[PDB]
Symmetry: D2
Subunit: 420 residues, 4 copies
Amino acid sequence: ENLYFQSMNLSLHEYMSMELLQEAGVSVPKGYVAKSPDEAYAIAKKLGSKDVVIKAQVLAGGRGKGTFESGLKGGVKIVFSPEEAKAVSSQMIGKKLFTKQTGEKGRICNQVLVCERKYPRREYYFAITMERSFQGPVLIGSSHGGVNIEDVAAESPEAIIKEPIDIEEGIKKEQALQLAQKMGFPPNIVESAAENMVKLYSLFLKYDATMIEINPMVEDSDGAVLCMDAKINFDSNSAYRQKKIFDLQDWTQEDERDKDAAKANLNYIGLDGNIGCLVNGAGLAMATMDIIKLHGGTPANFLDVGGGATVHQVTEAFKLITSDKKVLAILVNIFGGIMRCDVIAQGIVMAVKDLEIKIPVVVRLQGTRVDDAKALIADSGLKILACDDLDEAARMVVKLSEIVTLAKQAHVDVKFQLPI
Amino acid sequence: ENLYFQSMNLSLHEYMSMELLQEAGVSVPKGYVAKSPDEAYAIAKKLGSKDVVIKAQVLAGGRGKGTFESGLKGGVKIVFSPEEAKAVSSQMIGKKLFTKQTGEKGRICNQVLVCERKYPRREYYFAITMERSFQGPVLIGSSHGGVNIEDVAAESPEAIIKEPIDIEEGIKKEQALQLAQKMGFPPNIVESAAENMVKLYSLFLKYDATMIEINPMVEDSDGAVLCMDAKINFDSNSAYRQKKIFDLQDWTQEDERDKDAAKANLNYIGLDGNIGCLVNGAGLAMATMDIIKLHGGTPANFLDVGGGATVHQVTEAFKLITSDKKVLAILVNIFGGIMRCDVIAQGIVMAVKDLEIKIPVVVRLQGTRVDDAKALIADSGLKILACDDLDEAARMVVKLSEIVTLAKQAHVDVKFQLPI
Amino acid sequence: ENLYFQSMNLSLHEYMSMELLQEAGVSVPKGYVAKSPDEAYAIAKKLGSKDVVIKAQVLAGGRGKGTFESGLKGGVKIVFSPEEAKAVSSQMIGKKLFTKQTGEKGRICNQVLVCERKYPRREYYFAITMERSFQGPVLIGSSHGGVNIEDVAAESPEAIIKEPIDIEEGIKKEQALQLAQKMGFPPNIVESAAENMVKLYSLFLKYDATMIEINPMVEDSDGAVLCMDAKINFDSNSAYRQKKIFDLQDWTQEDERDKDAAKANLNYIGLDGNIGCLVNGAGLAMATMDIIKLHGGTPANFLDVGGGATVHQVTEAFKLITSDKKVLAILVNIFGGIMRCDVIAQGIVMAVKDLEIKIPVVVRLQGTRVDDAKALIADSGLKILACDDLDEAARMVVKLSEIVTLAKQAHVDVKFQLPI
Amino acid sequence: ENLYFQSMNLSLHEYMSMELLQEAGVSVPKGYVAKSPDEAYAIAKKLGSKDVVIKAQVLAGGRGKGTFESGLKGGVKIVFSPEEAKAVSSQMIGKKLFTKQTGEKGRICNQVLVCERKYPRREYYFAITMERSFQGPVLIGSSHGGVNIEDVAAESPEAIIKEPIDIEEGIKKEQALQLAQKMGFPPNIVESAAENMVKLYSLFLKYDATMIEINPMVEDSDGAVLCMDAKINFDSNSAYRQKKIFDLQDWTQEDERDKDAAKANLNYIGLDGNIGCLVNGAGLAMATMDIIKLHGGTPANFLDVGGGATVHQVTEAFKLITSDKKVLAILVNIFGGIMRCDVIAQGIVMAVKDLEIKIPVVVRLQGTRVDDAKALIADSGLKILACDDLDEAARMVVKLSEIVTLAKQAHVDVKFQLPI
């Protein structure tokens, strides 16, 4: 489901997206960022010392059901005095949040968002998303905000209004009024909704975004609709020309291995197995995972070197797989194409020679240079276990993983070589 | 049950024991040996060309229930003309007998026994056996011959008469009359029974026998009791001074590996496992089997080098284990004592160097010379996988057997070495 | 768990309790009752034609998760115009609500409650309950309203403030201020909370109530704390002197059998079995249920005739068990005491004679009159199957139920009589 | 397998058939009958006081594997003095033989057969049997006597010689010589075999026999072939004209119920169930058994009244089923035909009225008189539970058996009647 394997789209913390909406002129509750209880106190007394909401800036699927190490329920709190605001913030900042998505490797709440608490009258869901069905941006709107939207979308498909937009002519205000009036806005604040949607679409086109979800867009108790949440999924490919947004990327929310892989343009996918891999292209990565799971194995943490990567890239790759200790047997399964196989053969030679890779490297190299790669493998004269059949390679690597974990139990050492 | 592991007592073919009884003067039906149908014809016409019995000379537990490759039931047949005697003998000589004891590796019927057929009137079981309970020879007699004797012995212990004998004063004829009259002999042929028992005891003491079982000793239709079967279990230790009996040992009834082992004074025990061994003493052999079966393994074919054997003996031993292909991992588990451990270390060095023993040799050497053995193992500088704990050695060897059979499946080669 | 078997405490519809709070002077949102969409329209336009809440008046454990036959989710709705108020009310009034407590025999929503929608700022739970631990009324208060209170009470027992009250000296305002300030009220509206609690306690003592639960007591966005829900569990025994409250009892929420049983002072307990009963006292009723479930049976619908009931009461009882068709075998298990057993014997005689009770009546009568009861049973001369051992009676009745359901399958008729 | 249900062919004791062979002139070992140890002594001393065989006269499938109450193995013994002959006979006469066919209801050994013991030289099987395949008597001969013949017949069909005979021209001596020479008789005693077969065929035709099995026909140690066993299965239908043979029928070998049934020309079949029956014709008897076993029941002991039986016959029948106590529910399942159904209706009326048949009689009467039978059933006015569908009748009777055994457990009494 979803993509997962292909790219990890940049998700910002809540306060960054809230600031981005603020600078764009979108109507928004007053909000600030707190790194310590002191400025939390300062902002709480600045907003009136009463009726304040505190939100945790943690990137996870579960944020209201998570648990802190201090023993607090959820990531959102409602405080009514700056003193209790400091008290609760002292239990969030510097604390590790345990949610079901993390399980046990929870992310740490570095900052918090301090906002004014506003009472919503009606709850609308809204979302500007790029999509292939309508060959472009789509404005989705509904009057079922504040609640999970997939359930009502599946049970009541009519209630989810979807309107496409023509990109070359841009967005027209009449379209925004049409969407607002089809959702069911009050006839006195439709203009504000149209202005908010126009500003949101301008932000959507400017920052190279992919999906701006406002859930829920809520009318206040005194009109002047205000957005509550501003989830933004950006585009990974837009790193080259969107420097401001991508520089603010939070790196604490991912493993240091992920950061190192991204430093060299290598996709990384960790897992719960004990058979490392090194695969060219996501498709053959899922293929390798499926074929390993067929033979009773389970991949541990496998990579994706992209196309045209240098030898240093695959050297860093092998460093990255060998960094994890849960790995037992590594297979480099790269078929040829854009990624010139000879540089991978050179990279395996260099990486096995340097980092002392004693684990069984079940290589399987093909494509656009087979003579050079195999010739280099033979010239290097190592335990580089050559193979040339995908099913045979998977069988061999799974059996080698079992052999390694068995010999570790037996407290004996083994060395693997091709049959004569 | 029984001994099995310790020594394989010499069991002769039926015709040899029948001849031995004949030369001792024991009353016996006329019998001859046939190697081909031609002399079977000659003997059948010699005995009257009618009322003849043919017996198969195969050493197995099942002889009347076995099957030939030609498709004949049982090893005994009753022929009434020399022509049908030739016909049935052509289906016995040169044919392979399939019994449940053999299962599929049946022994070949080399010769047959041609005897006159006599109608028994009463069936007595009789047996002169050495035993520890009565500290010497024991004459066992009963009137339940021709039928398996353990069942009636267990159900009716009174019916099995047992009489001990004092060796220095020999056997007395009065004792033989007492035994005959307690079995229930007719009062007219008791003297013949006493003479037969005296002759049998003389044969028992002469040929260094251990158990002479006559089952069934039968009175004929005209008196003059005649023995039908003459099973004789001899003594293995009596080879030095009983040359005539032990030279007539049939070697076709055992595997060629057994013959080779006996040629060098090595006990051999084949099995259905895939972990070879090499054990000093039967007791530690059962210990090794039990400890291997504890860890899920199963020994394949393990030996017993006795005491004080030369280095050539253990070289031949390792040749013998490596001869079998069903073996995967070999453990030499010799503790010290009479068998000087240093000669075994020298033997493993020489045998691994010569026969190219690539299988994992999980050695475990101790006793009366540990410094010399370990020093020689270290000086030789091989894959001689040293170990010094019995449970650890069994764990290691079972895991190595699993590793070997797994790598054979994976079609990859491995080399085993001690952890650094 | 709970009581269930002993008494069904009178639970009023929401609007009746809301009116009771209104007449007592308790601060309360404006609310009205609608029986048809027309007055729903009238009240909606009366309250401002906007920001209105509609609640279903159904007595069930699940009210926000239930389903209507029309296909609407939950019993609460938020409407913003009188027209959509009429539209939603047309899908509530006259409709049958399906909740998990009912399963399939859902209660019908006869009326609805139309109220003004107010935005709560803080949510407090509060409850005046009679209890034995504190030998009287207890004021329970907490700052975790709007959410199920058992979870937070068990996980955080400190957060649930409990304060007892001395009945003879009444409640003191200082106690109300103490409770308000220990919950954490704002220091400007503590007086209003104290006045509300005093009025609620006066209502609690007046109407012979047992538990008044305000969940959640919420401060408004402009002070002047207003109660949202006003659950009231009354006292069954207080029917004699509380006529106004008990006359307003809604009878549609229970089976007509329950209404008929209450018309004659008989406790009724329906079930999912097929062995009817008729038991004196709740304790022996649970005893009979347990002993029937021991023998593999399951009681169908069993009663409780109380003490000193007339013969007409037990005649109506037997009419009531025989009314249900799911019953197969009926056991009257009354032990003596206050309930004079002879009148039950007369009642069984009359009821079996009149209503033609052909089902096996496994009677078991004892206590304070055994001679008269058994004499009357014998004089009447029927199939009144006498028994005098509790375990034997349960065995007999379970076996008779099996016999009856088996003979119904066989399409044959049976008649049961005591062994001669 | 076999017939079982249809007729119990008269099997005589061994000594009667041996005498029958003796009077016919068939060569036979000398034999006598002993009822007490005294004449056993007399005969043993008459035959030479030595070499005597004792056989038990018990009609069962297992005779050499059975057990006596005294604790003796098998029914055959070999004695060599009249004193031990008396001793063993004292453990046979008056003793109850336990074989697997009987299980626990073993037959009692009333007499024994004392015979001379002869040593067989060759063992031939022989049998004159009526059969439909060859439309008459068949002489079967083989040279595999003394051993079970079905195994060798199935494995080696060629070895079983079968020769048919033309009845009108009788048997010809040339045919007997042909059979003897095809079995493999010695060429000097073929004439004796032919004479024996001619005499056996004369006996076969005279006594209206069906199968005369000589197993094994054995040549003696001095020629003059002598028959050992002389099993004779006679014809049930030949009772009218074979008075001498059928008068000697032993009745102790069957249950007294079987004797009573045979006294009135009723077939009886006891079983291990608890649903009695009363069926016209064997075919519908197997049909009723199969249909009862389909519905989870098991018939107890069911009958066969033949054709044209009087009312007294079915009265005795019902007496016979009701005699057994293991029966619970009785079904009379007679379809019309030769057996006039009205007499069965009269018989059920009389038998239920007389013997006080309180068990549920699930009648199912049809055929050639339905008006009279049903009219009589209705006029008698009883609990005669009428039914008219075979599957419905089986369902009803199985359910009634379950109801009866359930009410017996409940210690309550029931009465069954047709639904109104």
